[PDB]
Symmetry: C4
Subunit: 219 residues, 4 copies
Amino acid sequence: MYLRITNIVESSFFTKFIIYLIVLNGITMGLETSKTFMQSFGVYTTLFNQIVITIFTIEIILRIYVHRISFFKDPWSLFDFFVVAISLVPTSSGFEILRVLRVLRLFRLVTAVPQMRKIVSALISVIPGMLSVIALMTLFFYIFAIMATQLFGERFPEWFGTLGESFYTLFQVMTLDDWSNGIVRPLMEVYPYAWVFFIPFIFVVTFVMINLVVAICVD
Amino acid sequence: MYLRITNIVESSFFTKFIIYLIVLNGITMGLETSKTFMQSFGVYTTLFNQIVITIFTIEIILRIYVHRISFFKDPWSLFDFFVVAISLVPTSSGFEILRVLRVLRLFRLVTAVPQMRKIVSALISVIPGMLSVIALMTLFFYIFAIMATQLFGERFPEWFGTLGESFYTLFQVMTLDDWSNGIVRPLMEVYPYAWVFFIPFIFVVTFVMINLVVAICVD
Amino acid sequence: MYLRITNIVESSFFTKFIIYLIVLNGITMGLETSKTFMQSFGVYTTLFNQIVITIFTIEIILRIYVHRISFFKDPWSLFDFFVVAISLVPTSSGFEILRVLRVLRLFRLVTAVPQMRKIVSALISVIPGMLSVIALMTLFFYIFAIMATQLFGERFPEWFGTLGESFYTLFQVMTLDDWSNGIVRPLMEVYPYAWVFFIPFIFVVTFVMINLVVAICVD
Amino acid sequence: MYLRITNIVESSFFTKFIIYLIVLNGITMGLETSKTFMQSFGVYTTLFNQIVITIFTIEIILRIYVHRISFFKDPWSLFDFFVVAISLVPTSSGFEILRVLRVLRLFRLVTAVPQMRKIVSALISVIPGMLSVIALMTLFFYIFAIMATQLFGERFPEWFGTLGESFYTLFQVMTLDDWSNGIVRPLMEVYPYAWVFFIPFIFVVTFVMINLVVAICVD
Ligand SMILES: [Ca+2]
Ligand SMILES: [Ca+2]
């Protein structure tokens, strides 16, 4: 029976049928957003919803008999498994995020289309050539986050009171978002020289980030 | 008479007479902005306006009897057609944006001049080699916009209350506009972990957006 | 006496004497900033100022004998004339900006030192290849600035009340400064659809500005 | 004994032992952040800290005999000296930044891993090409900061008023952070024309900053 189902699975119709469900399920989830619609046709939806999840487990079952180990060595295949997996966990217990993480299956539209796969892969492929710099910054954030936590966290515990909080605030300064009136101008009402910590922080981080951009505009 | 007018239409005079009118009506529209100027000379500029609107229809009419099918296959011409059409809809009824969309005619200075046309066309032509990315992002915004609506909509309806709202807020974070003090920090007073949703959303959206830019400098 | 002075002006010493004065007057103008310093050594620095302005007029006078009509055809040369001239206008009457515009002479340190000159020129040379785009946008701003004034200026005169105000506000959106909480979210409390004007406004203007930068990396 | 130690120091084990310390002292510093952790293991960590500081001075001493003059002509080595030196100052009176600057030793993880060194060096190497621009800008900032102080600092001393305050505010405008609502809109309530000073300032400073980025993407 193997070669029977291998022909079914590898069949263009099969793929296109899967893709069709995604674009239907995608549209369905955006409708699940309307509190009105759910009162009207929620039943219709949750069942259509459960159907797809059944169908998707079947597909993932089929997809593995026809690839075995070649499957679990495929990023795209793995993705799909782990996504449908999520959607499998019952509609209760644990963390209310699971019910919500279900919408991640809409990313299957990416996986089930090569043109998308192509673009994502083009994108991802740039990452390893960034890890040298990324690592550098992460070391950097970590060093300053620590300095900040012990320089400002006592008078300013919202922003710097904790290693995590300093990390967040330092990130915010890096995105340059409301950084002066929002953070440093205040900080300075107590610590006049805080500009000595943040202007340099800003130069370094902005400089590095520009280098990172030109680095990707060469490869 | 065909060749008589085909020789009038193609005439440098005719074309430069059009450009001359555009720059006048352009100037006249910035004057119509002034409450003071409209008092005293309202009728001047209202007549002068209706005058030009005729002249432009006459032209667009003449322009067709010379080009027929060729004219309804010229981007720049179709434009000119539709932009005059809008300017034709009676100063009443329906929507009042039509009185305001009439200012779109000043975009004719772009069509009716090659130097401008060159640059516009240059710009536009970059778009198709972005749609792969643009598609990806729209799918992404749609996914996260759904998650946000069903994670923050209840306590924060102004910002995430509706699928559209989340789209708006998500756009806003993407432009990095006032995103932390103002959206995420407030959010965190209730949802300590909201940072888990927004830092990743930001990395992705900004990474992708950098790629899209380096894409446009490899062409 | 011509050849005598053509050896005074063209000399190394002359030039390096001029440069020495600039860096001295420059330092002197940062000290004129302190109200303290002025209550002590203010007389010193006002004379020192008039002194330098004398010395500078002598030089520019000299410079013209040695160069005649060739001088008024050098960008850098014309500049120094204009800048020194501004510095000549009596410490009274008309506008006080003239007293303030005097500090523009410190731009002579650029005019009168190569490499600066080189770099400035490097930069300016990039401009003409932007004029097509620049022009394009200025038409675009103008069109929307008009549109906004008549869509939003009645309920929101601070921001869109005058054509000029719209230009300012529209500029501000383009710099993406506080555009959503500061301007559009408010606007929407009255004009729910205002998002239809600003998101498109923002795509266009951002897109364009990206191209203009990609252009400057082609040239 | 020279060649004995030159075989100890130059040894892989020596280096990898140093790296192993950094990553441990690094971890230990992120824990010294916790107020809880200090109340339980504070003594453990302060001793461990004093220890590592010795180990690093022993190393730095060893490192010097094996290299002599070649060491004080190595950037990376000098660094390690100064960084360790800072950590050497007696945890006591004087400034308190010295206790905080101690966390700078984690930058040794950069100095003592060739993969970091490379990337850092790759970055630093870009700086010389920028000094022509960097100089230009500093001159520019200096000129406008002075103008601003004498134009706006009487009514707006928080922001201007001091040559330094202007510098800061001008920096802020350049990062474009809250520049319109936060600064220029207010200024205009008193000085209607302040826009004539800040819009050009913004064009120029952002122009320059674009050219600088393009110059780095070509070298
Ligand atoms: Ca802001
Ligand atoms: Ca901002």
